[PDB]
Amino acid sequence: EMLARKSGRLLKGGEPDVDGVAKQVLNDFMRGKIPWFTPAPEP
Amino acid sequence: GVFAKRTMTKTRRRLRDLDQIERDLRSPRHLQQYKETKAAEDLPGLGLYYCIECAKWFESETSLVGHRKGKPHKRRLKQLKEGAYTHEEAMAAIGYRIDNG
RNA sequence: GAAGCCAGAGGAAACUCUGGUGGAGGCUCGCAGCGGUUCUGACGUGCAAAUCGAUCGUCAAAUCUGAGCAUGGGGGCGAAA
RNA sequence: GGAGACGACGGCGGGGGCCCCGGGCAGAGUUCUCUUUUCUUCUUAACGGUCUAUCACCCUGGAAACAGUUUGUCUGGAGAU
RNA sequence: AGGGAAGUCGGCAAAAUAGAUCCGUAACUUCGGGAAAAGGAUUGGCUCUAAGGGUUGGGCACGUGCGUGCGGUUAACAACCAACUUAGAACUGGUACGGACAGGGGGAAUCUGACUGUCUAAUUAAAACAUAGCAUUGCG
RNA sequence: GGUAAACGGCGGGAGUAACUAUGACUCUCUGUAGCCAAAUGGAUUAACGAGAUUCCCACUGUCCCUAUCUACUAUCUAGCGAAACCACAGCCAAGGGAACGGGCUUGGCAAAAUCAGCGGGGAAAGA
RNA sequence: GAAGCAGAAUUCGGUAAGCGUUGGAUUGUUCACCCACUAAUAGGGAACGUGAGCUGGGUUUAGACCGUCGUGAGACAGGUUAGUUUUACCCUACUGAUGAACUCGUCGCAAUGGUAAUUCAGCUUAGUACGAGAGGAACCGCUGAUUCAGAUAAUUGGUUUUU
RNA sequence: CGAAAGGGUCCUGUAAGCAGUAGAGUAGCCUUGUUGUUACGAUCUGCUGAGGGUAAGCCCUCCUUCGCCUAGAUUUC
Numbered sequence: 123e124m125l126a127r128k129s130g131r132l133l134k135g136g137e138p139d140v141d142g143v144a145k146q147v148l149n150d151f152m153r154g155k156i157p158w159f160t161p162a163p164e165p
Numbered sequence: 166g167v168f169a170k171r172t173m174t175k176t177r178r179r180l181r182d183l184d185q186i187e188r189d190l191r192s193p194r195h196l197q198q199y200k201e202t203k204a205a206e207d208l209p210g211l212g213l214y215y216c217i218e219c220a221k222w223f224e225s226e227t228s229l230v231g232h233r234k235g236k237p238h239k240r241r242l243k244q245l246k247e248g249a250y251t252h253e254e255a256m257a258a259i260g261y262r263i264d265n266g
Numbered sequence: 267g268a269a270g271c272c273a274g275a276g277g278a279a280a281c282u283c284u285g286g287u288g289g290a291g292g293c294u295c296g297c298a299g300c301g302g303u304u305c306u307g308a309c310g311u312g313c314a315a316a317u318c319g320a321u322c323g324u325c326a327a328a329u330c331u332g333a334g335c336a337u338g339g340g341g342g343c344g345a346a347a
Numbered sequence: 348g349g350a351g352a353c354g355a356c357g358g359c360g361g362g363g364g365c366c367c368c369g370g371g372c373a374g375a376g377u378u379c380u381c382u383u384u385u386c387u388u389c390u391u392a393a394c395g396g397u398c399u400a401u402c403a404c405c406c407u408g409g410a411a412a413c414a415g416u417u418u419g420u421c422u423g424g425a426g427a428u
Numbered sequence: 429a430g431g432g433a434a435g436u437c438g439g440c441a442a443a444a445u446a447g448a449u450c451c452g453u454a455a456c457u458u459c460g461g462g463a464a465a466a467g468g469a470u471u472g473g474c475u476c477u478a479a480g481g482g483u484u485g486g487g488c489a490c491g492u493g494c495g496u497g498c499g500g501u502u503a504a505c506a507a508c509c510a511a512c513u514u515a516g517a518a519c520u521g522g523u524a525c526g527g528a529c530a531g532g533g534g535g536a537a538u539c540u541g542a543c544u545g546u547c548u549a550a551u552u553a554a555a556a557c558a559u560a561g562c563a564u565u566g567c568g
Numbered sequence: 569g570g571u572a573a574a575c576g577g578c579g580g581g582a583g584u585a586a587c588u589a590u591g592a593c594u595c596u597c598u599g600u601a602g603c604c605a606a607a608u609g610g611a612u613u614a615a616c617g618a619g620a621u622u623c624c625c626a627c628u629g630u631c632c633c634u635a636u637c638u639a640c641u642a643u644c645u646a647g648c649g650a651a652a653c654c655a656c657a658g659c660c661a662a663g664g665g666a667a668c669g670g671g672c673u674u675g676g677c678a679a680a681a682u683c684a685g686c687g688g689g690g691a692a693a694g695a
Numbered sequence: 696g697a698a699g700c701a702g703a704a705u706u707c708g709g710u711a712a713g714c715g716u717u718g719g720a721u722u723g724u725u726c727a728c729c730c731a732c733u734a735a736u737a738g739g740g741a742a743c744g745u746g747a748g749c750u751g752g753g754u755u756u757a758g759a760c761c762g763u764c765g766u767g768a769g770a771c772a773g774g775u776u777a778g779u780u781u782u783a784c785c786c787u788a789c790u791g792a793u794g795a796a797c798u799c800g801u802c803g804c805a806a807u808g809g810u811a812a813u814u815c816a817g818c819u820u821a822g823u824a825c826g827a828g829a830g831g832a833a834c835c836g837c838u839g840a841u842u843c844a845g846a847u848a849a850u851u852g853g854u855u856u857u858u
Numbered sequence: 859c860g861a862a863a864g865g866g867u868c869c870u871g872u873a874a875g876c877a878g879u880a881g882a883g884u885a886g887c888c889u890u891g892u893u894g895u896u897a898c899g900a901u902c903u904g905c906u907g908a909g910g911g912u913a914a915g916c917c918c919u920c921c922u923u924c925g926c927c928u929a930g931a932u933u934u935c
């Protein structure tokens with residue numbers, strides 16, 4: 123909701139578009155726009 | 166300017182009635198039930214800026230203040246000053262009454 | 267709403283900020299014009315051997331257009347199909 | 348030596364014609380009520396005369412406490428006002 | 429009507445949006461843009477109020493409507509003339525107020541060609557062609 | 569002899585006895601956000617597009633499930649008036665070796681002359 | 696009809712085609728499988744033993760890229776995009792509508808052709824039969840509903856050139 | 859029977875015109891404000907469920923008017 127109100131992803135009446143914002147966040151996670159990795163097991 | 170004027174009279178586009186708005190102005194409990202039937206997270210401005218007379222939510226306090234200067238708000242005020250049509254006035258129009266003993 | 271220009275406020279100066287002014291662009295919405303995207307479109311011995319309607323592209327320029335003149339088939343011309 | 352003789356675009360200023368407004372004479376229409384009303388004519392050629400009209404140029408003089416000045420910042424001791 | 433893409437290969441078609449004033453406007457970016465992004469508040473009629481202009485016009489002392497020598501910048505005043513915008517307020521009708529007409533639906537992304545432009549007149553308008561930029565070769 | 573080293577070929581690194589091209593013969597190869605670079609480390613490229621694709625909100629006669637209204641036709645009349653196509657013709661069923669019947673065989677049957685429609689054959693695609 | 700088939704729910708088999716057999720999701724794909732509702736979501740033929748109704752995939756004229764092959768024109772293991780067939784007034788069939796002859800008309804008969812209903816639920820039976828328990832029927836009787844069919848417009852919605 | 863008309867029944871929504879100590883306000887004349895007054899002024903109120911329409915596929919009307927009528931032509935055991 124905070125991301126939607128910040129980026130202006132509003133439905134009618136200013137209701138935040140959590141569906142579209144979640145899709146955007148998932149695409150950013152998948153396409154190397156948010157940093158993440160699996161740490162290797164320790165020997 | 167009315168949005169989608171063709172289907173304004175559909176039941177799924179119905180707005181709140183003037184007698185209900187009068188009851189909201191008179192009793193805060195009835196307004197509380199009406200606001201309970203809504204979800205605050207989906208409301209404009211998180212439901213903080215509300216005009217009871219127009220039964221309307223606004224995105225900001227400046228938006229609400231600017232709406233109060235418009236003629237729809239003044240039309241609602243004039244309608245409320247004249248009074249809402251009710252079942253009791255409908256009874257009095259035909260000269261009927263309720264006998265409870 | 268580009269350069270140029272005026273004023274005010276700072277800054278040692280260079281410059282920085284604010285309000286104006288100005289009127290640039292193979293910029294943009296869009297009328298004519300030019301073009302020709304779409305539609306189980308009209309028409310299908312048609313009004314027409316390519317027309318009609320709605321819709322659409324472009325619209326100050328690599329824009330549109332007349333007349334005069336030049337290039338002629340082993341050729342010409344071709345932002346090339 | 349000059350004229351013939353020359354691009355595109357932008358805003359600004361002058362002039363003609365058109366459009367618009369007021370009065371007046373004459374005519375027409377409206378008129379249950381209202382409307383001193385609504386409408387029509389009221390023009391002036393080429394060619395000449397005369398008096399004038401931005402730019403620019405000339406004379407005096409010598410400008411800082413710089414000045415003049417366009418919507419648009421150009422002009423001036425190479426002489427401004 | 430009620431439902432709202434359940435239709436269909438596919439929202440094809442239609443519907444929805446639309447003028448103007450005001451609030452407000454993200455990621456990304458070649459910093460120029462994106463952008464009318466998005467999302468909101470309003471608009472009729474009447475009766476008023478306010479603001480924004482033009483033209484003309486100064487007292488003495490001499491010579492006689494002009495020449496000097498002065499003197500003063502409250503003309504900050506009078507007279508006359510003129511037009512269209514902008515802002516503010518009350519009242520009032522309402523099912524509608526850009527009342528017909530005219531008039532963006534918007535958003536998240538992917539592929540693709542840099543862009544403006546051009547061609548298969550009469551089935552293909554495009555990742556095709558051209559383009560600026562870049563690189564090579566030949567020639568005194 | 570030198571290469572645009574273009575096409576092309578091309579697992580490396582040491583050696584030597586060859587001694588120059590071709591060598592040949594052994595050996596053996598596996599930071600939950602850093603460092604270094606002239607802020608950035610990019611093509612995961614902005615803008616633009618009647619280019620191709622997926623989804624969301626709004627929206628609705630796309631359906632569900634159809635109904636109704638208007639104009640112009642179709643229809644009827646007066647006048648006017650073609651063309652395509654055409655061996656002959658046009659109800660079917662079973663059989664008719666060459667996997668074909670409309671005509672033959674055997675049956676069902678079968679009654680003048682007509683109008684609006686219709687799209688199963690038959691005709692109909694500059695087929 | 697048979698089965699440890701108590702009841703309930705079934706399983707296997709027989710006669711039977713009278714009557715039904717449905718939405719929907721998914722095109723990185725042999726589109727076949729998932730989900731639900733339901734009494735049930737049975738299977739086929741009349742095309743596919745070539746073949747003009749409408750419209751998507753095999754699918755393929757001419758424009759264009761990308762991959763593979765080729766010196767090349769070009770071809771293909773391939774992948775992508777955009778792309779012209781456009782009757783009916785004829786005969787038959789079918790659906791309806793007239794009709795000569797028998798004077799006109801009224802009331803009838805009925806050969807022959809067609810033929811129509813379907814399934815579920817609830818109340819009662821009954822918490823009964825049956826059962827250790829958990830559970831748990833049916834016939835007669837009654838009332839609704841699904842699908843189909845034939846009508847109708849009092850009411851309610853829709854439609855408005857009643858311009 | 860037809861054309862009108864009247865009544866009913868429906869549809870809309872309160873006609874034209876006049877008036878009003880209703881009307882935000884503005885400008886004049888004077889008693890300079892004491893509905894001061896007059897003028898204009900969306901709108902409001904009254905006359906007024908009024909006006910308008912009503913079969914074209916609505917109803918009634920010997921007893922509300924006006925008109926029409928025993929044809930013409932063709933054919934038939």
Ligand SMILES: [Zn+2]
Pocket residue numbers: 216217218219220232233237238241
């Ligand atoms: Zn309000």
